[PDB]
Ligand binder design. Structure first.
Ligand SMILES: COc1nc2c(C)cccc2cc1[C@@H](O)[C@@H]1[C@H](O)C=CC(C)(C)[C@H]1O
Ligand SMILES: COc1nc2c(C)cccc2cc1[C@@H](O)[C@@H]1[C@H](O)C=CC(C)(C)[C@H]1O
Ligand SMILES: [Co+2]
Ligand SMILES: [Co+2]
Lengths: 380, 380
């Protein structure tokens, strides 16, 4: 059931912002590893004396990478006279975030109808304010509330090109890379306590639960059309293998974003291209499942995927799960940076055609059971 | 004249260490951009709970990238029980360095006969101690003294594989990239006052001056065989174009390493390979000189380089200067990170054959005069 209880009008995921120590090197690594093009910048060359911000795009997916300059460059400025293009930015907050958590997601940004109203309604319903609504060049409104840990939910609304003050990148510095990624499908947080996290976030958004022995409990919050999807995990203690969620919390110094799932229009091309680059600056992937996993896959997805399509899944290490409505292809990268914290999922969904409805095929919860039996079966 | 006055036995440049916020992303970007292979690691997977350190190599060139983990991982350790592989590392120093200066060189490391003796003699002759000699696994001794700013001169000596505690990287994660770079030729510092800087460094090393209207004064310190070369620059104030050295000092928050010059065994291959990757994760280069520069080049290097070889220089944007002993091919990257501070020079030297003697062809001081006239000549 979908009660459609959003307390304000939400559209889609808009961008993800990483807080970095050096935005240039992270953005260049991510561009090559994921096939995202350099699209916009706000930095010294655009008159921003406060922070360096580089925007990568692939389809509708927008990754923003931001790092602080020396505060001495802007020591004469006050907020009314700032040259920062993102008015919520703060040198101390950014350095404190990065020293505490390492490289990771600071903001999950969603486009809304009216960011000022979304902020006001959110705070009236329990949201902890992080940055009040600010109107940029009479054109864009941005506001921020706390989501979990030091991650914020960022509201952006447009009266009618990323943000005022950002410049489009010259075509010479913008190479048209594209490995098939098209949008953010979901963004997953790890928290110490799931109950209070859900009550808080669902409390101020009106997002509803989307609904579906390995170390975690989880639930998924969704917007009215279920295109903004926010799974949240908590650890369960007292197993044998210590909770991977607990390990995250330790290395991250608390709650934060665990993974970003990026939808591909052709997951086989995406994974061919990404795997070609793993050892030459790109991203590494988890160990592939045993051959038993794919032998058992014909028995479960033999009617959605041909034997050849299943063979291509085994070449690339792709996992397959199936709902009662749709089928999900997925795979996970190794951690994106030094710490065993954030990583990326690549996904593609097949089914639930009406456009495709959000969450089609679920999130792969069944692949845990299937993987455990594959481990047992391959040992034999 | 070379007085050969080294106060201790110096061999060659050994490695350069960058202090980073995320070593993984910088190392992967540098690997792809420069054609350096992943060679060794010290991190969580090797039992290091303190810092992540990744070593890239190309020929004899060694770049080390290091970032701190959460101090909470090692909160129970003391220096006698540390899991750090580089005992001079300190979480607070590293975070303070990176917050102050951004991404940049922390250590210029030279191999010496006896690092404990080199340290002792250095400090007896004015060097400010940074990290006392420490013997690692009865095999390697490392010690550090201040060089300029927050950059240290690191002494390493071997009784007889990078450092104890580092593991060789598995061949699957180690792709054999190579664009032709073979060693560090020189490392250049920017300081506020050249005189006191030279007196300090020459005072404690015995390094001698190597000797050769655009905003700087400089001098070059050299070891006995002139294979360790350390140019130092100061700004000169009161021009029209404000000193580029002063701009560095402002954006860097003080003295630091300005550029690393990397010798290539084939600068044309190196620049072809590096330029292919500039817009797909690699490094950008300075704007090319006007065609007048290369027209005038035949008149000055027409006897060392054929017309075709000079044409290949113009394709790749390579600069040429000539000593009374040898000829130098050189080119400069744009800054390596967010701040307009550190950058890289690629060089190749021709002449001074005996092996080749250090500094052959100089450092390109004449290319300033030639560039200024090229600007005038091309305007016409
Ligand atoms: C690390 O996350 C995963 N790992 C998997 C592994 C290691 C094997 C097979 C399937 C996996 C699926 C996921 C995830 O996408 C999430 C999680 O499992 C359950 C609910 C969420 C909504 C939070 C999912 O998104
Ligand atoms: C930014 O440095 C340079 N820029 C050049 C430009 C922009 C044009 C032509 C030649 C250049 C040469 C250099 C440098 O290698 C140094 C410097 O000029 C003089 C003495 C040192 C020993 C310190 C050199 O190494
Ligand atoms: Co997922
Ligand atoms: Co130089």
């Amino acid at each position: 059931k979908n009660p459609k209880s959003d307390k304000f009008k939400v559209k889609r995921f808009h961008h993800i912002e990483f807080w970095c120590g050096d935005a240039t090197n992270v953005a260049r690594r991510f561009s090559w590893g994921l096939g995202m093009r350099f699209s916009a910048k706000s930095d010294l060359s655009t008159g921003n004396m406060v922070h360096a911000s580089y925007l990568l795009t692939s389809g509708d997916l927008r990754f923003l990478f931001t790092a602080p300059y020396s505060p001495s460059l802007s020591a004469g400025e006050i907020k009314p006279t700032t040259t920062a293009s993102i008015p919520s930015f703060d040198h101390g907050s950014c350095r404190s975030f990065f020293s505490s958590h390492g490289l990771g997601v600071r903001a999950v940004a969603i486009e809304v109808e009216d960011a000022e109203s979304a902020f006001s309604i959110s705070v009236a319903n329990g949201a902890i304010p992080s940055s009040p609504p600010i109107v940029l060049n009479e054109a864009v409104t941005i506001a921020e509330v706390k989501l979990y840990g030091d991650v914020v939910l960022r509201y952006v609304s447009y009266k009618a090109e990323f943000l005022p003050g950002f410049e489009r990148v010259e075509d010479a510095s913008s190479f048209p890379l594209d490995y098939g990624i098209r949008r953010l499908d979901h963004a997953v947080g790890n928290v110490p306590e799931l109950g209070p996290a859900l009550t808080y976030v669902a409390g101020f958004t009106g997002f509803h639960q989307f609904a579906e022995e390995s170390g975690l409990n989880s639930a998924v919050l969704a917007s009215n059309d279920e295109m903004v999807l926010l799974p949240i995990n908590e650890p369960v203690h007292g197993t044998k293998r210590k909770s991977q969620i607990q390990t995250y919390l330790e290395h991250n110094e608390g709650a934060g974003l665990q993974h970003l799932a990026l939808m591909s229009e052709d997951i086989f091309r995406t994974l061919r291209e990404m795997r070609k680059r793993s050892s030459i600056g790109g991203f590494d992937f988890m160990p592939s499942p045993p051959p038993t996993y794919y032998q058992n896959l014909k028995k479960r997805v033999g009617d959605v995927l041909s034997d050849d399509q299943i063979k291509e899944c085994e070449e690339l290490g792709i996992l397959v799960d199936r709902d009662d409505q749709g089928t999900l292809l997925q795979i996970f990268t190794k951690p994106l940076g030094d710490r065993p914290t954030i990583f990326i999922e690549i996904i593609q969904r097949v089914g639930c055609m009406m456009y495709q409805s959000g969450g089609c095929g679920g999130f792969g919860k069944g692949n845990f059971s299937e993987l455990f039996k594959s481990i047992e079966e391959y040992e034999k």
